[PDB]
Amino acid sequence: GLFGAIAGFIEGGWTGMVDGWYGYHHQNEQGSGYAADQKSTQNAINGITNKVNSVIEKMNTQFTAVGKEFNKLERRMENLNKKVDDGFIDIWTYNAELLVLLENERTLDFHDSNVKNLYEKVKSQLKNNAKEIGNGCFEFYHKCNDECMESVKNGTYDYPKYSEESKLNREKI
Amino acid sequence: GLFGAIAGFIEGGWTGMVDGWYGYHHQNEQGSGYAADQKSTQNAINGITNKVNSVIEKMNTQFTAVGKEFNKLERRMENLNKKVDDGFIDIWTYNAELLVLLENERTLDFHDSNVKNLYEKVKSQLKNNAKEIGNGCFEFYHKCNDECMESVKNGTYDYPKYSEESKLNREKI
Amino acid sequence: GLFGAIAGFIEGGWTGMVDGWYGYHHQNEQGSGYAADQKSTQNAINGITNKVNSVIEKMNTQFTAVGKEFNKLERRMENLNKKVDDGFIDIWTYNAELLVLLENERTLDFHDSNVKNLYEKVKSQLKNNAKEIGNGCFEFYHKCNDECMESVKNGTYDYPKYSEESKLNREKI
Amino acid sequence: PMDECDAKCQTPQGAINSSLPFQNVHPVTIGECPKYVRSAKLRMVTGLRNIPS
Amino acid sequence: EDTICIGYHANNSTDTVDTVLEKNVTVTHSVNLLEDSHNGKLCLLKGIAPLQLGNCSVAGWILGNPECELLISRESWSYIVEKPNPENGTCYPGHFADYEELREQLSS
Ligand SMILES: *[C@@H]1O[C@H](CO)[C@@H](O[C@@H]2O[C@H](CO)[C@@H](O[C@@H]3O[C@H](CO)[C@@H](O)[C@H](O)[C@@H]3O)[C@H](O)[C@H]2NC(C)=O)[C@H](O)[C@H]1NC(C)=O
Ligand SMILES: *[C@@H]1O[C@H](CO)[C@@H](O[C@@H]2O[C@H](CO)[C@@H](O)[C@H](O)[C@H]2NC(C)=O)[C@H](O)[C@H]1NC(C)=O
Ligand SMILES: *[C@@H]1O[C@H](CO)[C@@H](O)[C@H](O)[C@H]1NC(C)=O
Ligand SMILES: *[C@@H]1O[C@H](CO)[C@@H](O)[C@H](O)[C@H]1NC(C)=O
Ligand SMILES: *[C@@H]1O[C@H](CO)[C@@H](O)[C@H](O)[C@H]1NC(C)=O
Ligand SMILES: *[C@@H]1O[C@H](CO)[C@@H](O)[C@H](O)[C@H]1NC(C)=O
Ligand SMILES: *[C@@H]1O[C@H](CO)[C@@H](O)[C@H](O)[C@H]1NC(C)=O
Ligand SMILES: *[C@@H]1O[C@H](CO)[C@@H](O)[C@H](O)[C@H]1NC(C)=O
């Protein structure tokens, strides 16, 4: 919840669904259930794919032989080559470790952005037709079937469908 | 559209305008047209200026001579100096390449933020006076001249100007 | 104000309060005053703590001896060891300097996110009960005591408390 | 000069506080030492921007 | 009538940084990463003293130049101190081979 959801307006996670990292929880007369958002989920995971390929590939590992050895009349080259190699090991160590911390932080922010984006997409259809509730959810002033669920998933609502039912069931409140 | 606009709620780009990277498209009785937002556009481009100066300048290129050469009784120093220089080349290569990827990603996010910011600025004046429509745009419940356009560009509306016209032309809807 | 507040919709800073980096300014009949948001403030500052510990610690400083010296029959090793060490100094210099610029930029964005998050939290309770005003603030269509202030700080309002007072004092406007 | 004072890192220009990660001061050191750069300054932000009006 | 506002901190501070998108960027609070300063002394490690040659070259040190204090008491130490241009090279000259290697061997 850097941008305000997860440990934000949302508190905790849900183990009920495992098909994909995002989704909805539908609630209606036919019942309850969880259902995953494969569209943006798979888009994101492809992002992670192109990331980690663009992490691992950036190395080039030679056909290498690391080590050397010297007498005690070559201490310059010894203590040097120590200083050399320890220099590099510390550098790669430092940079790589920073890269792990940063890229995991940016990964969380990537997720945070995606969920928040999607929340606004959910919001975009149902602005006056249905209300914010609590956190994470919207209550309808009308009724919604699984057709309405699946339609609302892929970015389809038909705004005038239940516009009047919302226009009346609001008005008691 | 990391933060939700470009490939987000906005789909695609516009070739009609070339003066600056951002702007508006005005639509009114006098006609249509595009008009660039030099304020935030130039601010951003100055950001890119200070960036790239703060990229290139961070190198210091010595008056350098790269190369060496040895006999075959100096293979230690040879294979060393190979390992040395290849070490560095791979390091600079790695870091710089990561920096290109990251800074272009952060560049897109910089743009995304600027446009989204501006969208909220547009929204901030006209909250009840005029409505969200579709994506990217707002329809007015009143009429707007080029004076109204240019005023709304620089952060001026006079909220009570068409407050009542919106207060009535809403009410049919 | 990358995400839209500080030099964004907010213009400038406030010296009146020094207890913590964030807070509110309460205004009511009993009077005015500033009051700091220790919750998110301290959370953030703990973030800075874990950051800077995760900056300094990533170095490992050996029990080191830097320097060497040679004759003029060892110019290879001389100009080498110059090229070596200057190589490293420039590398550490470059990477570290970039890290300062980036991490301060990301620090500003961290702050920007936190304040914007909090602004939405303030907004989340009082959506129809009270209105946006100007920038940075909300005017109430009802009256709020210090109990109401402190409650609204920790994420408590009781929405139906002044729902009707807002429902009437709106309606003149 | 030379003095009875104690330290953890040292260089010809002086004895050195080994607390901080970096110097820009002088490359040569002995001990548990900061690391040299060619720079003027390096200052992270703790706080944030300052504007009265 | 009543109002709620956001709030945050400013101060009298004029401490600055440089940044990707702006320079001399003033903030309220800052922290200097850097140790730009030196005490201008030759302190000692840990309570362990360093060795001192004063004017002497290492040849005048190791060999037993009487003008160089032998200082057999100095059994081990923190680091070696010289000047750049040591006065007392060898009173009877003679080429000294592997000075570099020896000094490396007597690094510590
Ligand atoms: C230790 O170092 C000191 C300082 O360098 C040496 O003393 C200096 O030695 C030079 C040698 O050329 C002296 O100059 C010579 O003086 C004699 C007269 O004494 C003259 O015949 C030569 O033509 C030349 O001018 C210099 O005066 C002398 N200075 C002092 C203050 O002693 C010293 O010899 C070194 N000792 C050892 C054991 O290495
Ligand atoms: C190091 O060299 C300096 C040379 O500058 C020596 O200085 C001399 O000190 C004596 C008294 O001890 C004076 O009488 C001389 O006039 C000084 N000479 C000069 C040129 O200043 C110093 O004594 C030497 N110290 C050691 C430990 O060898
Ligand atoms: C969206 O879902 C509805 C039913 O929920 C379906 O009729 C329609 O074809 C779907 N559209 C797309 C683009 O998948
Ligand atoms: C903003 O635009 C209006 C007309 O559209 C103009 O009268 C006013 O001077 C402008 N203000 C600024 C600060 O540019
Ligand atoms: C929140 O504030 C109210 C009064 O403003 C207080 O009664 C309540 O205990 C507080 N809750 C928490 C969790 O601090
Ligand atoms: C060494 O540096 C630390 C941190 O900068 C400081 O707390 C301490 O007082 C310094 N000590 C000396 C002797 O400079
Ligand atoms: C700013 O305030 C701090 C704390 O009161 C003080 O140490 C500093 O001297 C002040 N600077 C000026 C210029 O007033
Ligand atoms: C910061 O840099 C800008 C560059 O134009 C300049 O206007 C301003 O005076 C500078 N401030 C200081 C304190 O150097």
UniProtKB/TrEMBL annotation, chains A, B, C:
Glycans are attached at residue 154. It comes from the Viruses. Transmembrane segments: none annotated. Disulfide bonds join 144-148. This is Hemagglutinin HA2 chain. It comes from Influenza A virus (A/Solomon Islands/3/2006(H1N1)). The chain holds residues 344 to 516 of 565 of the full protein.
TrEMBL record, chain D:
This is Hemagglutinin HA1 chain. The chain holds residues 287 to 339 of 565 of the full protein. Glycans are attached at residue 17. It comes from the Viruses. Disulfide bonds join 9-33.
